[model samples]
Target: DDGAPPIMGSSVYITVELAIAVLAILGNVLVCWAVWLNSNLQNVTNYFVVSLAAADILVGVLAIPFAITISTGFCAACHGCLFIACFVLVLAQSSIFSLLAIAIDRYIAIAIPLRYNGLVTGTRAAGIIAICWVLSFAIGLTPMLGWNNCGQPKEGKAHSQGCGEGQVACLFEDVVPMNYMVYFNFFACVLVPLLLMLGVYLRIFAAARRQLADLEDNWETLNDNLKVIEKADNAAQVKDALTKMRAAALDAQKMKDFRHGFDILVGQIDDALKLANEGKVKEAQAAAEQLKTTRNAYIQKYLERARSTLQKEVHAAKSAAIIAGLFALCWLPLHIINCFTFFCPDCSHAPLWLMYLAIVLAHTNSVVNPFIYAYRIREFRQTFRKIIRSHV
Candidate 1:
């Protein structure tokens, strides 16, 4: 043991990582196929699933290769650190916009059915999908470009100035703080998306309320007419009113539709808040489940025809939000890990394995999203079976 560095990984950990890569690759590929081949699965919401699959696919391909390189005792081999940094950013930005698309899609479908069809056609959705990837790539690639400062991206860094202050080890001693990559992406790629989705749903809820109020007024007028008809001996007037009632009652469905979206929003907000309170992830998760349970009851009672449809839509948004929310929750822990490793040097504020676990868990989200799409959605199932049948 005269002068050699420690090995990077254990056999068990590498085996687990290989399993994750395999699962993510297979899951994301199936998602792409399910949406691409099945016309029935090609909705605006599912379109985001396609984009997300592509993102996760890239991450799985790039991320695993770099991890394997590291595990094989080749830490500096092929610029592994730089590529892995970029890989995580790509996955992060994709998750953000993919979720944003789902949030907006749900707001449109549940809050404005007639207009939603006009606004979110398949072609338009495809365009929006295209835009999300292009923009996400642009934002995620920023750090990689910054490596060259302005001229030589592949060359690494354009200028080698002082560390600005905290020059710890020769490990990027002259470079900017490595934390900037995650922090910048956290603000632009994560928080902004969260706020946008919240705003999208909020406006949709308010609009639906106005629509519901008008419907209720119409129902009240119809009720008054029926009440006078019950006592007045006016046969012709009653017959006319009866014809109107038989043909159609006031549009009570408007109120129901509004309430459906409102309940979903409430559930989502509850879930988001739970996610914010970092100390209680289990309780937060429980609160999210309770909201879902209550929403299911209302869906059964009032929005029966729309139950599967609504659940699919709401589940997509909720899961996406929860994924992003979890990221924000776990971010601070890794930061603490970094600080402890730095200032104390000899003391341990956080465990090394737990720090690595948090890092790995953050990357795990991209793969998790594909499974969520595959399992919770009926359309994904039908699309998968249809494609399998075609292949067989």
Candidate 2:
């Protein structure tokens, strides 16, 4: 037996630990290198990624090798194993908290893009990362600091141990206190951070869905403007029909007045035709001149009514276009910020001045759109005047 008893596992277990340790080291180190070399990746979100990678790296470097030693019956036979166990705990706790920080970073960027840059500045991000490390250390070092150690005998008589023996015989007794072990270590450190990560990502996904909906349909005024344009097209066709109808109606009225009015009733047209038939054609032609004068004032009355209908249809179309344009301008800033946020990480890829220019243009378009609409359409003028009057 290697120790007081044969408690160590086979060589296959030691080989497995060595294999996992190598893979963990290489994989995490590659993550760190890739993020470091890519300038575009240097941002608030990736900062947490690097921190988690470092914690994982620590596990492979310290924790895995220690486990292999303990399995090979090296550290397992003495008090030195407790120190390695504490180191493993710290790295594990840090990895979980680091992942939680990444989720919050995504939420801030996607849920509230405009306010993200304002809230998660470089200094603030760094400070929270520091807090994660500090809190991990505080929790992980509890057992090693002064709590539940088994190595100290009441009288410093002798150290006795056996590999297959019960845990009470172990030289170093490392245990978390039962009172707050589940609360502080299990639930608070591990489960709570994980739940927080899940909650933050849920909110981020919701924001993405709403943004997609807005982009697909300019949602507020797309259909409203389309419906109004259809109404305008109908009005134009009605105007053409009314114009043709008015001319035809005037012609019908003129013919009816010559035939049926006082001149026709007194037999002016009848006398003209009768004289022509009697071969007094010059007298009949002289009688037709009186017929033309009687109908001249009748066609003039129909001309006034057609002009009035044209004005009302044109006014309705102009009003719809102006309001739809105004609403489109109001949504411009949200669109700009949402698009810019995806590409601009840490403002390194895009400058603050350029973003400010975009903001100014968005606001300017919103402010100036009403005035431009009012200048072209009378309905816009009246509506804006009402708004200003109410504010005053």
- lDDT, each prediction: 0.57, 0.50
RMSD of each: 15.8, 27.3
- Model 2 misplaced stretches (Cα beyond 4 Å): 1-8, 72-80, 149-181, 217-220, 232-392
Residue-level error in angstroms, candidate 1, position 151: 14
What is the TM-score of candidate 1?
0.62
- Provide the lowest-lDDT 10-residue window in model 1: 166-175
lDDT for 195 in candidate 2 is 62
Give lDDT tens digits, candidate 1, residues 167-199.
211222122233554456555556667788778
